[PDB]
């Protein structure tokens, strides 16, 4: 099944989660086709600024991301930042998120790998696609069986990532992929109408799932405030990608 | 609002290799009736790197054997200028007359172009951000162009490497038609020394993602046997697989076309 | 307004090693006495290529070493840690803490370091604009750090390649102290496939553009046979032409130090 | 000799020519340790408006560096853009310029060496350094002996350029290597506060000569008004780099 990876960037409030967490659910009701999996981080541990959003604490996210599960019977995936959190966060966390920046810390991936939980990577701004098969073969030596790498952009001069869509099918050699539509056009340190347009690239690629973050009210979000997804149009960008990728698949190479 | 497909050989190797290629592209014409084709061919590469490569075989060779496909098969015509004094004697057979992607910014050249009354394709330089081309279709409109195109052919990025930054496409769409060039952004520049690179595994892949974004047409070099080519050899297209890719074109522009948004 | 050289192996391989680079950087404290040596090497090579490379001997047998150095030579320490829990054992012996390239906006490790009271050094991430150093310096003097220092060690130029822009140097001067790291910022990240490469011979040509334009220190690793050795085999300097680098350092600091602009 | 090249951008008018020539030739007078070479540029044919300043034609340009050879007695550089040019302007021009964008251009190159004049290239922005012994090449096969490179940045991201110094030893492998300080910095379509920085850089790493735009009020300058130096600062750059060089030329490789 194809992958859609959904929520709000960061955990404002346990009663944020619930109204994404019921559109989610909502959609998993709609799209057979697809596995949802609810995503949303406990911790913005990498901000700009001393002074932004970081969250409510490892505690109280993992309580929020329970309450979700419990209440709507989604799978569930959050980042973690240190790796004493993987424990903790693997009681709730169905896939364990490994941040961009911390793609090469051979302890926070041993520490993801040990908790018997699938494993995502986003790729470092920094890395080459083949450069992340060595990131995979950390995560096998640690016991991981279920793995993926994300695609969210890379450094482009200053202040700016550019997507190289030949990474999908590089990545591919060696992980399921997974596109980032919401990270890859934000602009580190237009925006909002670039998410669409390389969402439908990269399942015309062809990859195994997208990765979108979504809240109600994104000019009130407290992280990622200029690229989250308005909740009321996720349906509308899930149905198209589905429907591209029902076409576009006849010609995904064999890798 | 029928779509484009530029394609040919890269240069114009013999009037016999562009009269094989036409009669194929010819033949697809006649069955992709919803497409418009236009028959590529260079009559000289003249930023190779290697003083040592091919260039071709003169402009008058090459004008006459662009004539001689037009005349055979009715196609389309573009092909490439490099100084000011070619647009005219280009113009003759020309319908698009093309801007090479190092030349995108030398304002004699365009308005050579410009007041021919052909169509002006330019190919956006590896140094230009897509919202520089605003000023570059202002030149062409002030020179009298009426139609013109942009094409998307890759951005530096580091050394002997393009990136192709698809945000491009709904950028450069404000101001001009766009085009995907689906053959050059995956060649490595100067990759192999005296000669530049590419990786053909690559070209599919991203013109499936050119016309999920939504462009306006591709651009695609295509040889009957790209490793005996005497450019580009790395990067043009079998024409045996031409077929096959502008089918899947046109399938996937159509079910991603409802979600183009309005520029 | 003493220069400092911060020096020593990449990675702690023995305590034998460190002693002997110890050895020499003693003795080249003893003659350039205008500079301020701080003696450096890894406890853990945390974020190698390879699951199967070198990363060191632990902490603790790392913390012993370079205590040993210190007690030895009576040279200032300076490590790197990699999670928060390592700030308050480190700060027992180092001087100086470290934090590393990719971990420059962790802001819990900042945090960590900022409050045991020692200096704290930042490698500039590769992913970073020489402008956004100014939050990172906020966060350390928000956590109670009062010596700061921004190291550069290059920026991501394509794949598998980085860039030394010398304009970050004086951009970063406005809030902090600045080092120039010579030898990582002439290594091919990855480039080795399972691990990094480089190259050797830009590192003095660098060295000096960094002094002529203006920094507070270098940075530069150094181990007796680097071709030896278990980490950065590829650009750290052979100890034995340390002092000559120094001595050509100085000479064109002075010379160009009084063009150096107010900042 | 250390080559100095300097000039205003462009021939405002054969007054400004005069004004800036009249100073080069005080400096070259007090610098014997220098060869100067006078810069200014015919026409800016390559402008990203249509309505910024191109010049007064190729006419009035070899004239009015006709007359700053004949009242001064100083060398000559000027840019050609077509083939044809290459000729009338080699009646004037001791270094015959191929600007960064033309410098892939086979019939350019050829011209220009066929004039038996000095040919310097500007490195186009999407050169590698490495890929400019090919253009050595060409300059070589068509007769030129005496050739020089020039570094003036290379494409990095958008609006962008940087100064990878390495270029300079890697070029002196097949050509006199020199400088430009003035367009490195510039943003194409903080600039000036970085110019006198990386020319101490340049001399500090080791080049044959550098180039800087001049004028004695760049605010009214027609072109590249954001980076040329006021010529009041020209004399003490000059002194500096050449201290620089003093000292730091005792560690230029062999190369
Ligand atoms: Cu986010
Ligand atoms: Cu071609
Ligand atoms: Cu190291
Ligand atoms: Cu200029």
């Known amino acids: 099944k194809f992958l859609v990876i959904a929520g709000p960037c960061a955990i404002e409030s346990?009663?944020?989660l619930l109204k994404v967490g019921?559109?989610?659910?909502r959609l998993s009701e709609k799209f057979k086709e697809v596995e949802f999996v609810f995503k949303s981080s406990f911790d913005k541990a990498n901000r700009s600024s001393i002074h932004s959003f970081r969250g409510h604490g490892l505690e109280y996210g993992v309580?929020?991301?329970r309450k979700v599960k419990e209440e709507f019977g989604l799978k569930i995936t959050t980042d973690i930042h240190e790796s004493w959190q993987a424990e903790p966060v693997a009681e709730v966390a169905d896939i364990i998120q490994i941040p961009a920046f911390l793609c090469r810390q051979?302890?926070?991936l041993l520490a993801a790998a040990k908790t018997g939980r699938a494993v995502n990577v986003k790729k470092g701004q920094f890395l080459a696609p083949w450069d992340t098969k060595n990131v995979v073969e950390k995560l096998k030596f640690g016991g991981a069986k279920e793995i993926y790498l994300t695609e969210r952009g890379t450094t482009f001069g200053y202040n700016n990532l550019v997507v190289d869509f030949r990474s999908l099918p590089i990545m591919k050699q060696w992980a399921k992929?997974?596109?980032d539509?919401?990270?890859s056009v934000q602009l580190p340190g237009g925006m909002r109408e670039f998410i669409f347009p390389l969402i439908?690239?990269?399942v015309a690629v062809g990859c195994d799932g997208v990765f979108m973050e979504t809240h109600?009210?994104?000019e009130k979000a407290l992280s990622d405030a200029s690229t989250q997804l308005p909740l009321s149009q996720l349906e509308g960008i899930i149905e198209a990608i589905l429907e591209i990728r029902e076409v576009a698949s006849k010609y995904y190479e064999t890798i």
Chains 1, 4 share one sequence.
Do not use: G, M, Q, S
């Open 14 to 16: 346990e009663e944020l």
């Open 22 to 25: 019921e559109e989610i659910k």
């Open 63 to 65: 309580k929020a991301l």
């Open 106 to 108: 051979t302890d926070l």
């Open 177 to 179: 992929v997974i596109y």
């Open 181 to 183: 539509a919401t990270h």
């Open 200 to 202: 439908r690239a990269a």
């Open 216 to 218: 109600p009210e994104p």
